[PDB]
């Protein structure tokens with residue numbers, strides 16, 4: 173019942189500073205523009221200890237499955253090859269990605285009827301708000 177309140181199908185309803193976050197990460201111009209236009213759905217499910225998060229949009233469909241606290245390799249939507257670990261910290265899903273000596277952290281939180289995603293790369297934070305589909 174670890175992630176019950178995250179499970180479901182969510183649709184992006186607002187974004188702030190995502191282009192700048194992507195710039196800070198190192199994403200190139202064309203990918204930033206097309207990815208920034210996307211209105212993804214985020215589909216979260218749990219089966220036993222395995223959490224699956226899918227992101228689907230006109231730009232890209234991605235899928236990760238993982239066990240909390242157990243590192244895995246991830247190819248991101250912008251084609252980084254990263255080492256990822258996702259944990260629960262005080263009811264927040266905390267996703268750390270490591271590559272090329274860099275690090276970014278993505279937090280997913282339930283707030284009211286929304287799922288709020290905060291993406292941090294060095295001093296740059298982007299906030300993406302999802303609602304139930």
Ligand SMILES: CC(C)(CC(=O)O)CC(=O)Nc1cc(Cl)cc(Cl)c1
Pocket residue numbers: 193194197199203207214227248249250278289291300
């Ligand atoms: C958690 C997430 C960050 C944001 C969301 O799910 O809303 C997933 C995502 O879109 N990743 C991403 C995509 C591109 Cl193309 C470039 C970079 Cl840096 C990141």
